[PDB]
Amino acid sequence: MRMQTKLIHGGISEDATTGAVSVPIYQTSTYRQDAIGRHKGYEYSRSGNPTRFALEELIADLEGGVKGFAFASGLAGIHAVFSLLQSGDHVLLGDDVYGGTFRLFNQVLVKNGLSCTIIDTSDISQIKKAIKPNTKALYLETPSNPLLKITDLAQCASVAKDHGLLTIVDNTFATPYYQNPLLLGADIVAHSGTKYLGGHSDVVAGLVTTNNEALAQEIAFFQNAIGGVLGPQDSWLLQRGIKTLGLRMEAHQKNALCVAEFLEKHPKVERVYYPGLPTHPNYELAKKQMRGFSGMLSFTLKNDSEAVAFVESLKLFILGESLGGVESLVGIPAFMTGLVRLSVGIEHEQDLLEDLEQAFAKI
């Protein structure tokens, strides 16, 4: 079965006992057991839950892993991933990773004996040079946010492997529909389900999956030990949202192209950051490792002062703080995470252009 068919029938997508084409929401905390040391499969909802498990199975099935793990948020998942390491360990970050991941290290992890080194990861040599005797992981994120900066996954993975290093990839922007880091040498993949996977701006969730059984034992342990689990209703809604991913990602791509092209041939606009443009640095690398480009695009205007007047005069893009939803979103990462980030939604392309038009006419 193909990706499109897997989004609908993958993992667990059916109640085995009733035939329900939808996995039931197990709003429960505990489970009755036959004799002690002989359970019915589930013991306690923090450790495992049939609804959450179905979702965890789905994301594993999609990214080509052995196990999935659903979390209360993207950050909670990432946090649990880094709980695999001791104090005295080192991690190499990309120079433009998501701000909350930076704050995770800066303010939570570093504090606990975990050191990081920020480097440009599209500069393969900057990673070669940055490894210390205690470096235990390489944390990549491509396309990056904002700026959509592409990193070479297979290369970095190869390089991380001949050193005793973990390749941990944040696949949020380019979904499992467009990119599968585990098939390119990654050990652990993390998403914000809060974004595209959910895709209706109505769930806060993180998903992690892995290629490695030993890694999976570890991640499980810390999901259970720290307990930042995804609830069953959210799990169910995430899975429901995931069902449409393919169609949504297609529509996201189609729209964001029209938007990028229109923006590039504009008098008010200077540079434009989108992976689908032949004009974007490493465009070739992208077509190599991505089956498509999402709906994210940063960009800048020649007049750097108007940035805030432009964003605030738009009437169809929602001025808000997330991305990856069916509604188009807009931000300015200066005060949020003269650069303007667009999360192109799945509204009619013309209405999106007409909305950008009228907001340009105003500056």
Q: Give the ranges where the chain is alpha helix by DSSP (H).
A: 3-9, 50-63, 74-82, 99-103, 124-130, 153-162, 213-226, 232-243, 245-264, 283-289, 307-312, 349-360
The CA–CA distances, whole Å, from 29 to 45, 50, 71, 263 equal 5, 11, 16, 51
Q: Would residue 38 show up in a list of annotated catalytic residues for this protein?
A: no
Name the minimum Å distance from CB 15 to ligand PLP. Answer: 26
Number of residues near a second copy (by CB under 8 A): 81
For residue 73, give the 3-state DSSP assignment.
coil
The residue length of the chain stands at 363
User: Residues near 348 by Cβ (< 8 Å), separated by ≥ 6?
Assistant: none
Residue of 61, 89, 152, 170 marked active site: 170
- Region 312-331 residues binding ligand PLP, contact defined as CB under 6 A: none
Name the minimum Å distance from CB 37 to a second copy. Answer: 6
Note whether 36 binds a second copy by CB under 8 A: yes
Contacted by 170, from ligand PLP, a second copy, none: CB < 5 to 8 Å by type? ligand PLP
Number of residues near ligand PLP (by CB under 6 A): 16
With CB under 8 A as the contact rule, which of the stretches 138-146, 162-170, 296-304, 317-325 interacts with a second copy? 317-325
Diameter of the chain measured on Cα atoms: 74
- Region 215-244 residues binding ligand PLP, contact defined as CB under 6 A: 227
With CB under 6 A as the contact rule, which of the stretches 94-102, 108-116, 176-184, 264-272 interacts with ligand PLP? 94-102
Of 284, 351, 354, 357, the one binding a second copy (CB under 8 A) is: 284
Note whether 73 binds a second copy by CB under 8 A: yes
Six-digit token string for 325: 């939803």
Note whether 354 binds a second copy by CB under 8 A: no
Note whether 178 binds ligand PLP by CB under 6 A: no
* Residues 104, 75 contacting (CB under 8 angstroms): yes
Contacted by 321, from a second copy, ligand PLP, none: CB < 5 to 8 Å by type? a second copy
Q: Would residue 46 show up in a list of annotated catalytic residues for this protein?
A: yes
What is the distance between the alpha carbons of residues 52 and 67, in angstroms, rounded to a whole number? 12
- Region 97-116 residues binding ligand PLP, contact defined as CB under 6 A: 98, 100-101
- Measured from the Cβ of residue 71, the count of other Cβ atoms closer than 10 Å reads 29
Q: Would residue 32 show up in a list of annotated catalytic residues for this protein?
A: no
Q: Tell me, residue by residue from 127 to 156, as one string, x for binding to ligand PLP by CB under 6 A and - for no binding.
A: ------------------x-----------
Note whether 13 binds ligand PLP by CB under 6 A: no
Residue of 98, 139, 273, 274 marked active site: 98
Note whether 325 binds a second copy by CB under 8 A: yes
- Measured from the Cβ of residue 290, the count of other Cβ atoms closer than 10 Å reads 21
Evaluate the CA torsion angle 245, 247, 249, 252 in order and state its sign.
negative
Of 70, 75, 127, 159, the one binding ligand PLP (CB under 6 A) is: 75
Q: Would residue 195 show up in a list of annotated catalytic residues for this protein?
A: yes
- Region 145-184 residues binding a second copy, contact defined as CB under 8 A: none
Name the minimum Å distance from CB 263 to a second copy. Answer: 13
* Residues 249, 196 contacting (CB under 8 angstroms): yes
DSSP letter for 231, please. Answer: P
- DSSP bridge pairs for 90: 115, 135
What is the distance between the alpha carbons of residues 210 and 12, in angstroms, rounded to a whole number? 18
With CB under 6 A as the contact rule, which of the stretches 73-81, 102-110, 150-158, 262-270 interacts with ligand PLP? 73-81
Of 52, 149, 195, 248, the one binding ligand PLP (CB under 6 A) is: 195
- Region 33-72 residues binding ligand PLP, contact defined as CB under 6 A: 46
- Measured from the Cβ of residue 27, the count of other Cβ atoms closer than 10 Å reads 12
* Residues 177, 246 contacting (CB under 8 angstroms): yes
* Residues 57, 102 contacting (CB under 8 angstroms): no
Contact positions toward ligand PLP, by CB under 6 A?
46, 73-75, 98, 100-101, 145, 170, 172, 192, 194-195, 204, 206, 227
Active centre residues (catalytic): 46, 98, 170, 195
